Amino acid sequence: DFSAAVPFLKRPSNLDGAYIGDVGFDPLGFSDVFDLRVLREAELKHGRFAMLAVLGFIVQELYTFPFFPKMAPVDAHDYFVKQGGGSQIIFWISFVELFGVVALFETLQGKREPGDFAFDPLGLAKDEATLERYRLAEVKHARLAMIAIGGFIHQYWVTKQTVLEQLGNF
Amino acid sequence: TAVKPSAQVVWPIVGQEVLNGDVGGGFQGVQVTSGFFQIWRSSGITSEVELYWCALAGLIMSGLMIFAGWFHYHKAAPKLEWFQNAESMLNHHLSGLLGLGCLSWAG
Amino acid sequence: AKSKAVPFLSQPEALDGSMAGDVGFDPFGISSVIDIKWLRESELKHGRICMLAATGCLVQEVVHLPGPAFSQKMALNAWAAAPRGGMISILVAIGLIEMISNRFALTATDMFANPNRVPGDLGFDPLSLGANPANRARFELSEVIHGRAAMMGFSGMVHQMIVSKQAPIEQLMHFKAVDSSLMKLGGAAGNLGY
Amino acid sequence: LWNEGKIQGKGVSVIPLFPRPASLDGTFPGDQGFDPFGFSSWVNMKFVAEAEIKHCRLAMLAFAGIMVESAGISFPGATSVLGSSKNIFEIHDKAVASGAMGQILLWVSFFEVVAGVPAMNEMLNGESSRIPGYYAFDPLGQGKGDKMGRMQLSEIQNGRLAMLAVSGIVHHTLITGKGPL
Amino acid sequence: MDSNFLKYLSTAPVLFTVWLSFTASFIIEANRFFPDMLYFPM
Amino acid sequence: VPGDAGFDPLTISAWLDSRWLREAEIKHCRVAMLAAAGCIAQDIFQFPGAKMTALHDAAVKAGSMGQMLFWIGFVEAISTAATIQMLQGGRARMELSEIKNGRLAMIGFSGMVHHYFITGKGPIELLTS
Numbered sequence: 016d017f018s019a020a021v022p023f024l025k026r027p028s029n030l031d032g033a034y035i036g037d038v039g040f041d042p043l044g045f046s047d048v049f050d051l052r053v054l055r056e057a058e059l060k061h062g063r064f065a066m067l068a069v070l071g072f073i074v075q076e077l078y079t080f081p082f083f084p085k086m087a088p089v090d091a092h093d094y095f096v097k098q099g100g101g102s103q104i105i106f107w108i109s110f111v112e113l114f115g116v117v118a119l120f121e122t123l124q125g126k127r128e129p130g131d132f133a134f135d136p137l138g139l140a141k142d143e144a145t146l147e148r149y150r151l152a153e154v155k156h157a158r159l160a161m162i163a164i165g166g167f168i169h170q171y172w173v174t175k176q177t178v179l180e181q182l183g184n185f
Numbered sequence: 186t187a188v189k190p191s192a193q194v195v196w197p198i199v200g201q202e203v204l205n206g207d208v209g210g211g212f213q214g215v216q217v218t219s220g221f222f223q224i225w226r227s228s229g230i231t232s233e234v235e236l237y238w239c240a241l242a243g244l245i246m247s248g249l250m251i252f253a254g255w256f257h258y259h260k261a262a263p264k265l266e267w268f269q270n271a272e273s274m275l276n277h278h279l280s281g282l283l284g285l286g287c288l289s290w291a292g
Numbered sequence: 293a294k295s296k297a298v299p300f301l302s303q304p305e306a307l308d309g310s311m312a313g314d315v316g317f318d319p320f321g322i323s324s325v326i327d328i329k330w331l332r333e334s335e336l337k338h339g340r341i342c343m344l345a346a347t348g349c350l351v352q353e354v355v356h357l358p359g360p361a362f363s364q365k366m367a368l369n370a371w372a373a374a375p376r377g378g379m380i381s382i383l384v385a386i387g388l389i390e391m392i393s394n395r396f397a398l399t400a401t402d403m404f405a406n407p408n409r410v411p412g413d414l415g416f417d418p419l420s421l422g423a424n425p426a427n428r429a430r431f432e433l434s435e436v437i438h439g440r441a442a443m444m445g446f447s448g449m450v451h452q453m454i455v456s457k458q459a460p461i462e463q464l465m466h467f468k469a470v471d472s473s474l475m476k477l478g479g480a481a482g483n484l485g486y
Numbered sequence: 487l488w489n490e491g492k493i494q495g496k497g498v499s500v501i502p503l504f505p506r507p508a509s510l511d512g513t514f515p516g517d518q519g520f521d522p523f524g525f526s527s528w529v530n531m532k533f534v535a536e537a538e539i540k541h542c543r544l545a546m547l548a549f550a551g552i553m554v555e556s557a558g559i560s561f562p563g564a565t566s567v568l569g570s571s572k573n574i575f576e577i578h579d580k581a582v583a584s585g586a587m588g589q590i591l592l593w594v595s596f597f598e599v600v601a602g603v604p605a606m607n608e609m610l611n612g613e614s615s616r617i618p619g620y621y622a623f624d625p626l627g628q629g630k631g632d633k634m635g636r637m638q639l640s641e642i643q644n645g646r647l648a649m650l651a652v653s654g655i656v657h658h659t660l661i662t663g664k665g666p667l
Numbered sequence: 668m669d670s671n672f673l674k675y676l677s678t679a680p681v682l683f684t685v686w687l688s689f690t691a692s693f694i695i696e697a698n699r700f701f702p703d704m705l706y707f708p709m
Numbered sequence: 710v711p712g713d714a715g716f717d718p719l720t721i722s723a724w725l726d727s728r729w730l731r732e733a734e735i736k737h738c739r740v741a742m743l744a745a746a747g748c749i750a751q752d753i754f755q756f757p758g759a760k761m762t763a764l765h766d767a768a769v770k771a772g773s774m775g776q777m778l779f780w781i782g783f784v785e786a787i788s789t790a791a792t793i794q795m796l797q798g799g800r801a802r803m804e805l806s807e808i809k810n811g812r813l814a815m816i817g818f819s820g821m822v823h824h825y826f827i828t829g830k831g832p833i834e835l836l837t838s
């Protein structure tokens with residue numbers, strides 16, 4: 016059959032709706048070679064980091080903590096490389112990513128969904144149907160935010176104005 | 186004609202940092218004799234940034250070759266009648282590998 | 293069959309909820325390679341040493357034996373100032389305690405040879421405080437928890453004495469934040485040495 | 487009273503915007519649905535109930551104290567040694583400096599150490615069948631059915647309102663720089 | 668982790684290289700922090 | 710099969726895939742349609758901030774042609790997936806009209822660019838002057 020997204024491209028054949036958010040889009044054929052659990056692991060991880068980054072880029076413009084000096088987020092990266100806070104964040108992410116390595120091994124061995132860490136403290140996933148719609152929304156937001164974060168950082172480079180101030184000006 | 190090429194620096198451990206000799210240009214290191222500096226100047230490199238891009242190009246090619254070896258043994262292995270094409274292989278290795286390679290380098 | 297501590301991982305085998313402090317926390321699966329009896333001996337031993345050590349830092353800050361050799365508020369300085377002869381006496385006494393309390397079954401190959409031997413149970417109850425079997429389970433649990441808490445706390449106290457050259461509660465009462473110019477982490481290979 | 491079906495009881499949701507969860511049980515006093523984030527699914531219900539009643543009682547007593555110390559009302563000689571101001575924050579700081587707050591801290595801590603923690607441990611283990619927050623402290627009568635039916639409901643609601651109101655008062659006083667009354 | 672990959676890491680050349688690289692590494696570190704130990708200091 | 714006038718004098722169809730030939734021809738057709746209609750449109754009216762051939766290098770320096778190359782390059786990567794999957798395995802009038810107008814557009818564009826070489830001018834400008 017044909018891909019739902021691209022009508023004239025054939026369906027990849029490793030993508031038969033097994034993973035939510037599948038629209039049959041995979042022209043370069045990475046699912047014909049590589050494991051889709053690993054690729055969905057990577058898609059959801061990149062997407063969650065990007066979603067947090069876009070929220071951070073905007074909120075950091077709106078507010079910053081009193082103990083830290085006020086500055087733009089790219090300058091924040093460089094300041095906290097030299098200050099020590101960046102190493103703390105890198106270390107704690109690396110610490111969590113150790114048990115993430117264990118989690119990815121559990122996914123490869125079949126006993127875990129690729130983005131599932133059982134992280135539902137506030138019980139928002141009331142029912143299975145609600146979870147399916149929520150994870151479709153998570154996939155769509157994750158992809159959209161990857162595009163968005165690239166835009167903010169690259170535009171900041173080209174025009175040295177922050178995202179809220181760039182919308183505010185021009 | 187004054188600075189001596191050096192592209193290897195040793196760590197200080199057991200007194201071995203004596204090997205970082207005064208090669209010139211405000212630098213200490215092991216003098217290298219492979220002629221890479223003269224190759225790079227003939228190429229027109231003129232900066233370390235372009236050497237970083239060449240190192241990345243080598244890393245990308247290295248990944249593509251190890252992928253291709255895996256792919257052509259485990260996923261798509263040619264049959265014997267493909268390898269037993271001496272005329273085709275010579276046509277491509279003379280015309281394509283050597284001739285295009287010389288032409289692209291001439292450009 | 294998922295872990296209770298780590299809900300997205302499977303419950304590790306050799307962890308069945310029998311032992312006190314068993315919450316299923318073994319993500320790296322050390323218990324699948326190393327026998328759980330040896331691991332519980334080592335956990336109880338580390339924790340007991342740390343419980344005494346954490347109390348040692350705090351009390352050594354407050355109360356001292358007489359004499360100038362024992363007047364070291366900062367505990368990391370007490371190591372160097374306290375008489376060497378007596379410190380090595382402590383070390384030798386610890387070695388004799390280790391061989392006798394374990395009854396010459398000290399090696400990984402021979403300890404627990406006797407089926408009566410229990411992890412952490414050396415027979416130490418001088419005042420028979422564990423005579424009541426009703427209190428046994430919560431005593432075992434609170435010993436395990438005090439040991440874990442004290443491992444973390446002593447680790448913190450030693451490396452905060454390294455960063456700030458102050459005894460722990462005096463550090464709390466005369467607190468100074470890290471400049472970040474000093475105590476740089478790593479960096480031996482970034483500058484290529486020196 | 488209990489008023490089962492009308493208010494509290496079971497099946498009553500004060501905010502129909504959130505459906506009443508099935509995890510929540512209709513047998514806790516002053517319980518009316520209101521569990522949006524689903525905490526009752528996994529928390530010990532007796533522990534959080536005892537915690538709610540205890541937070542309620544601090545909130546009520548704290549409200550009574552904030553109002554008295556903001557109306558200028560005092561015990562004899564208290565304003566002589568403590569301040570004459572009516573700002574609750576400054577009174578706390580100078581009563582800390584006087585040792586009075588340390589004495590209250592001492593005796594409250596002693597009551598928790600010897601009585602609060604055993605009452606908690608027995609009530610949660612399942613050895614005493616003590617209902618949450620009960621300490622047999624009913625000197626001036628007022629027991630019987632009304633105490634376990636309407637008065638129990640009254641304690642829980644008046645306390646929740648006291649929590650909201652005291653949080654409100656302390657935040658308003660800090661931003662304005664002026665107290666109530 | 669896969670048991671066949673862990674069985675590969677248990678092969679003699681891998682363990683030999685890892686063990687003596689670890690051994691070499693703590694001799695190097697001990698001579699970095701404590702260099703020129705010609706004698707046991709006593 | 711559409712637009713078959715029996716015109717293959719050198720018989721290229723015998724020694725190259727008919728699908729590859731048709732996809733290449735229809736791509737050439739549509740590109741020259743856009744190019745010729747654009748060629749006249751540039752002289753008719755102009756977008757703000759802004760000849761036939763010189764404008765290529767007047768546009769590359771801004772970065773416009775680099776941008777258009779990047780987006781055509783993206784679409785052409787998906788289109789190379791399309792043509793490989795094509796090759797590895799009341800409307801007929803509308804296709805035939807497309808193919809005829811596209812061949813006409815290739816001739817027209819070739820004409821306009823060489824006329825630019827002749828006179829340094831655009832198509833309808835040459836007609837006006």
Ligand code: CLA
Binds near residue numbers: 268270274278
């Ligand atoms: C134009 C076609 C072409 C080219 C360039 C090559 C090139 C090569 N073949 Mg040959 N080969 C061809 C067709 C071609 N083959 C055909 C048709 C057959 C079937 C009969 C074979 C069968 C064949 C066998 C059986 C073997 C080779 C091997 C090799 C490699 C020789 C070792 C060497 O010098 O590599 C180093 C030199 C380089 C320049 C490295 C370049 C790497 C890439 C692949 C070159 C081409 C990239 C691309 C076309 C360039 C894009 C340019 C763009 C940026 C503008 C070399 C990569 C041998 C080998 O090593 O296999 C891996 C080998 O065992 N070939």
Ligand code: CLA
Binds near residue numbers: 381383385
């Ligand atoms: C074979 C027996 C023996 C002998 C002859 C000595 C002889 C000596 N020791 Mg001792 N020592 C021993 C065993 C012995 N030690 C053991 C087994 C330990 C390990 C627990 C120690 C630990 C030790 C320390 C840490 C110190 C000495 C010191 C001294 C010297 C001075 C003693 C003094 O002035 O006493 C007169 C003083 C006292 C009687 C004061 C006693 C202080 C109280 C009782 C400490 C509380 C003990 C504590 C609860 C230990 C519990 C752990 C234990 C059960 C394992 C002297 C050379 C001191 C030294 O070298 O100074 C130069 C010193 O600092 N020793």
Ligand code: CLA
Binds near residue numbers: 547550624628640
């Ligand atoms: C409106 C408040 C209110 C209500 C309805 C209750 C109701 C109850 N309490 Mg709780 N309690 C409260 C406040 C309240 N309490 C506070 C603040 C404390 C801390 C001092 C306590 C401490 C407490 C303990 C330790 C125990 C109870 C228990 C009980 C139950 C049996 C006792 C009884 O019925 O007598 C209640 C009688 C009355 C409420 C009569 C009214 C008296 C008023 C409230 C005093 C007002 C003080 C003052 C004038 C403040 C106003 C002025 C200010 C603004 C300046 C019943 C469910 C027992 C139980 O079964 O627990 C589950 C138990 O063991 N209570």
Ligand code: CLA
Binds near residue numbers: 740743744764
């Ligand atoms: C492929 C043919 C082609 C080419 C190479 C160009 C190139 C150019 N034109 Mg011309 N133009 C074209 C078609 C073309 N245009 C068409 C069809 C029209 C009629 C609507 C125009 C009308 C036109 C005017 C009026 C102006 C330009 C201008 C420009 C320049 C700036 C880029 C721009 O704004 O594009 C404008 C192009 C269009 C509005 C239509 C483009 C046609 C397609 C949709 C773009 C292809 C890219 C596509 C998104 C990706 C491929 C997918 C495909 C399957 C659809 C550049 C010289 C401006 C300039 O700098 O002049 C000095 C100017 O003023 N052009």
Ligand SMILES: CCCCCCCCCCCCCCCC(=O)OC[C@H](COP(=O)(O)OC[C@@H](O)CO)OC(=O)CCCCCCCCCCCCCCC
Binds near residue numbers: 106478483
């Ligand atoms: C259960 C117990 C858990 C213990 C947790 C450990 C907590 C502390 C860990 C480090 C904290 C943050 C580090 C930032 C500090 C940091 O990253 O500095 C960077 C340093 C390298 O220096 P650079 O290249 O960064 O120089 C950078 C320039 O900015 C400055 O010149 O990295 C290291 O290699 C140091 C660590 C030694 C690596 C080998 C360790 C010994 C190997 C033993 C076998 C393996 C054990 C595990 C090895 C990782």
Ligand SMILES: CC1=C(C#C/C(C)=C/C=C/C(C)=C/C=C/C=C(C)/C=C/C=C(\C)C#CC2=C(C)C[C@@H](O)CC2(C)C)C(C)(C)C[C@H](O)C1
Binds near residue numbers: 069135138155163170
């Ligand atoms: C999972 C979990 C929980 C959680 C959680 C959390 C923290 C969730 C946070 C989720 C977030 C942060 C989602 C954000 C998505 C961002 C998107 C879609 C990008 C939008 C930007 C666009 C489209 C743009 C743009 C543009 C460009 C690029 C540049 C501009 O010049 C112009 C322009 C503005 C047009 C909780 C704790 C609640 C519990 C629960 O039980 C389990």
Ligand SMILES: CC1=C(C#C/C(C)=C/C=C/C(C)=C/C=C/C=C(C)/C=C/C=C(\C)C#CC2=C(C)C[C@@H](O)CC2(C)C)C(C)(C)C[C@H](O)C1
Binds near residue numbers: 337357358389
């Ligand atoms: C074995 C092992 C474990 C362990 C352990 C550990 C870490 C145990 C550490 C034990 C320690 C620290 C023992 C310290 C003993 C101190 C003594 C006897 C002081 C004597 C002072 C004297 C004689 C004096 C004096 C005087 C001098 C000379 C001159 C004057 O001017 C001053 C002064 C008046 C004071 C445990 C139990 C946890 C578990 C497991 O089973 C494995």
Ligand SMILES: CC1=C(C#C/C(C)=C/C=C/C(C)=C/C=C/C=C(C)/C=C/C=C(\C)C#CC2=C(C)C[C@@H](O)CC2(C)C)C(C)(C)C[C@H](O)C1
Binds near residue numbers: 343418447
């Ligand atoms: C069993 C047995 C008996 C016995 C016995 C004995 C000797 C029992 C003694 C038990 C002891 C000594 C327990 C000590 C626990 C210490 C803890 C939990 C400290 C945690 C520190 C933390 C969390 C921290 C911290 C800190 C950090 C890092 C940051 C700092 O800036 C500050 C801060 C301080 C806050 C006897 C002999 C009676 C007989 C009986 O028949 C059998």
Ligand SMILES: CC1=C(C#C/C(C)=C/C=C/C(C)=C/C=C/C=C(C)/C=C/C=C(C)/C=C/C2=C(C)CCCC2(C)C)C(C)(C)C[C@H](O)C1
Binds near residue numbers: 093165166
């Ligand atoms: C190095 C450096 C830093 C950094 C950094 C970072 C994070 C840099 C950011 C990198 C990122 C996220 C780039 C994103 C690129 C996405 C693109 C080009 C979308 C293409 C979509 C296309 C072509 C079309 C897509 C298609 C169309 C038609 C629409 C639908 C979808 C699709 C069909 C696929 C800092 C900040 C730490 C500073 C530090 O001191 C040094």
